[PDB]
Assembly symmetry: D3
Homo-oligomer: 231 residues x 6
């Protein structure tokens, strides 16, 4: 394909999709065996290894709906990827989402226009694949990793002047990131399975920041949950 | 309250919400013990009885977003209802939705302006309360009731000359009905729990019908699942 | 049809369309002779009688644009109904609309999306059928029943957080209910005649409520006017 | 005011509003006595004369919503005009609108953003002042001038590559022109009375023309009706 | 055509398009030789003369997007006009646009719906023809006529209640008039060349008015620049 | 700042903004002397060096409006960057855009909601800083680098099932890419100067490719022009 430099076969059925190519590299080297770099196009790294003798690829997506839209589409159409699990971070916008919680996005809201372009007068609500979602839930509970399930917001603009997250906070929406809507929409469009697992980077509404050691513990929890979600 | 004739204490914490008031009476009379009809205003009946020791209210909502919104707001605001579970039907829009599958809605797309009216340039995806959803999932699996989880479309025009269900089918959307988005949006706004459980009434894009026997079977399943959410 | 349980012929040319099925029953029993219930589907009652030896049906519509849209469509497509007269109540939003006035809606505004779904960049303005409107006007004046003619608003949400009725009040709009737009739009679409006759339930903008005896006198006036509108 | 060169008292309570300033002079000179041209700014002429004892002003508005809006705002705000009656033409979009029918607009649909700019997610249906409308109806019937009442479409692009008049015809809409929604929306905002009276210039969807004799006849009818509203 | 009363040939390749028909007449009589009126339809005058022995027409457009849209379309489709240069005035909305500056509109913003009707979910940005724009720039600098290049706003409503020019002022937008968007969009649509040259009528945001003698000097500068823009 | 690891003073007044960070390193290493990589956060590299006595920073932005917006906001807000010039490629959508033509964007249309989110019912046309544009034009003409000036389309879906480039081609639009509107809108908001210079990567509506030799040639041209804006 155009944005991915793999050959036939270099990419597994199941892909983790972190935002940051350097987290992709870090995840591949830390949790996966017999690792290969199959893509260095644009510095957006893709690696394939094995976890408990199952093939698993890890492809950085970049930030924003357009970036992930390109890689999801090309992972699906050109490499027949079946399961797409995003593993990133979001900004918590409610007091009750706690800094160690691992979030499983059931659906996403958005101020992207990608779906108004498609459906016009329809509000399209992207849906996670429940099968994936459920395995991710049970893998969390099993170990007793704390976990929260609900909706997120897919922002188009990180530094938003007209930010309505204060309203979305009052409808139960959990946090803001910039990718989920695009993942779920394209996955669904193509008959593939998708889920987003998010850790809390900060609390947006009180400025309050997570420490580097909490972030590091929840990240581990996230990747680990993810790794037992398929089947 | 303006559309519900009940006093304090007549309405349960937990309320089932069929569209049809005669299905509400049906549910109340068949499955609940010690039943009182608490509302006859507009012939939109509501009943309260008990099921395994626990008060369960059953309330007709009528058809469409505006209608269910009036009832859900009043149930929430005037009667401090905590759990709101819609039990109804929907037109299957995909072949892999089979006539017997009980659907649980994670979320719902809509052509309703209700949320654009609230949010401007945000698409608000309404969300089911996951605990209720999991409980309903668990209860279906525990009995072996066939169950599919995913999304519906909450339509405003049952008869839609510019229907976009042909495209919504291509994005995974399971079926079409007329209330869910209202219920899920208003429940969350007021910090209450909501879930929609739905049986198939027809296959819309093959026009094809489900028999009265299939519907009776699937409607029972749907009640028995609900009663354990 | 699907939502109406009549046979061929049980429904007249002319239908009154009140919101409340129990007002449908009350109207049928009070003003009409030789009454039959032809529909009990969903508790949404339809009756047919005769008034001064002319056939007239009365079908509850339910509340909101979707509910009425279903019954209007099925009254038109499956029973070839020619005249559709809605007879309900609205909330008065201007001081100069008085509690005894019977309102004849010439057009309606709306925050329903039913017409943006249809026309997109077009603002569609539903229009009453003037012939009906005029007969309704002359039947009012004739008796000296007080009557006001103008536009209404068809709300989607009864308990609206973002309510703009304060602005619509400054453009001359008379009151808010939840059905007119849908009636006029579908009627027009199918080449049928439509009109909405409304009584004032309350004044929305000062909380001020009508008494049960005023409501009862204007309701009579409304139905009576309606009953002499066709031809 | 910025676009009208008149002093206090030169402009009537009642003002006719043709699109074309040469039709304004035509109306003023043919039907009114004791006529003064009160405005020549931008060659958009306005005249005042008398008809049966009563001052009648006649003012060109130009073409389009933006144009008529400037004039109508200024007539209202600077000159306390009470009655504003547009007299013009429109393209018939339906077969049952005949070339001789004088149209009175109850309301108007539009592709103009003017009202969405004011109201967000509301469709504002502009409304005619019913008294003026009834008076014009009565005057047409009293003489036997053929008259049709219903809705028009106020377009922004006379030449519209994405024209939706084919669909608006299916919803009853009688004809297409370019001002009415502006007039009806601004009149009501400021608590004044407005009405549009319109003759047919062509049948747009059969392309077909009306003869110069038909138009002259229908234009006279239209004036004589107006002069009694 | 319908709104223009010329014959074959009466209109030149290049047209000046002022808002005011009486400015069209004034421009024709003051700067052009061997003048003919070729259109008096609607009092919207069109004249053709010669400037330094080149043919040039001057056609009043009227005010607002619809008015100019009609004449541009008919100048293009029925008279094969190649270059369309608008020569009007705008309201300056930033302090740094000065009362003698001649503005060359590179692009326009708008609250007209003409382009949302066409493209829907697309924001269409009309573009000036650079060739014209560049000649107009060089003709200004050459003489040392002071000149500013940027974007304008094409208002639909002169007396706007919900006016957002305070926001457009913060994005660098220079001034407001009511025609440019329509000109550039139709010109572009048909493969023709277009540019808008504007003088400052007032400063909108401080009420501050230009004097009748400044207006008269910049108007001269505008027409003169325009007259050396083609080729 | 959150996405750029630079200290005070490491970033130039003037910053080139290719989409691809490996093209950023390429630009920095080939054309600049005395080069330091000031950022490796997210592997979105930024370099600073000198070109004819003058600091020039080169910064990867990634793909899409959201991505370039983060970088441009931070470059502006945290590093007081004055000149922001995007150097990249775009799919030619018209036949009269030839493979060698260097495009300068006057403006950009978009399907991005970013500006509707800011402005409601206004279409905001983002504008290039004309001085930068003229300077780039002049530098292209001074060398005889083929140059076309006009508009692009800033897309959000590279793969767009409901693509409207077939219509945008008919209105003059030269090519399609994914950043420009963000850059031009954010630069102007904060009173800084911006310009987009773009080479052709393919002809989208004839599907047809440009050879690796053509792209290398046009990419060099594009850099050499930029370096004199
Ligand atoms: N508070 C936050 N707000 C937004 F809009 N995005 C956040 C936030 N925290 C983390 N992210 C994730 O990190 C990247 C942006 O830095 C994006 O890739 C995004 O997914
Ligand atoms: N095929 C169907 N399409 C739509 F739009 N709604 C359906 C369908 N089947 C059942 N329903 C549900 O029943 C009521 C409609 O009679 C509505 O309340 C709706 O919820
Ligand atoms: N103040 C009011 N506001 C709204 F939105 N609707 C009103 C009001 N008063 C009466 N109605 C009519 O009564 C029913 C809703 O109770 C609906 O059927 C509606 O037609
Ligand atoms: N067929 C027609 N279509 C449209 F859109 N407008 C029409 C038509 N006929 C007459 N008009 C009226 O006359 C002027 C247009 O020349 C406009 O002012 C308009 O009001
Ligand atoms: N301040 C201003 N605001 C707006 F909206 N338009 C202005 C302004 N100044 C001059 N114009 C130009 O003059 C005419 C309107 O009087 C229109 O033709 C328009 O082009
Ligand atoms: N044909 C093309 N279509 C679109 F939408 N974008 C294009 C194209 N060619 C190059 N680009 C630019 O390169 C990146 C996409 O790989 C994006 O950053 C984009 O700017």
């Amino acid at each position: 394909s155009v944005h991915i430099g793999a050959e036939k076969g270099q990419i597994a059925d199941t892909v983790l999709l972190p935002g940051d190519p350097l987290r992709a590299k870090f995840i591949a080297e830390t949790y996966l065996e017999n690792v290969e770099c199959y893509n260095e196009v644009r510095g957006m790294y893709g690696f394939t290894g094995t976890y408990k003798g199952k093939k698993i690829s890890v492809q950085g997506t970049g930030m924003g709906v357009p970036s992930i839209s390109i890689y999801v589409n090309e992972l699906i159409q050109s490499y027949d990827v079946q399961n797409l699990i995003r593993v990133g971070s979001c900004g918590a916008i409610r007091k009750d989402v706690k800094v160690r919680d691992v979030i499983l996005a059931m659906t996403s809201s958005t101020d992207s226009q990608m779906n108004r372009v498609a459906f016009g007068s329809v509000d399209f609500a992207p849906c996670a694949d429940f099968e994936l979602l459920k395995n991710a839930y049970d893998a969390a509970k099993d170990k007793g990793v704390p976990v929260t399930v609900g909706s997120v917001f897919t922002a188009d603009q990180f530094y938003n002047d007209d930010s309505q997250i204060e309203k979305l906070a009052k409808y139960g929406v959990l946090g803001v990131e910039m990718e989920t809507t695009a993942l779920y929409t394209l996955a669904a469009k193509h008959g593939r399975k998708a889920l987003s697992i998010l850790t809390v980077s900060d609390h947006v509404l009180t400025g309050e920041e997570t420490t580097a050691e909490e972030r590091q513990t929840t990240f581990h929890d996230m990747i680990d949950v993810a790794l037992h979600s398929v089947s």
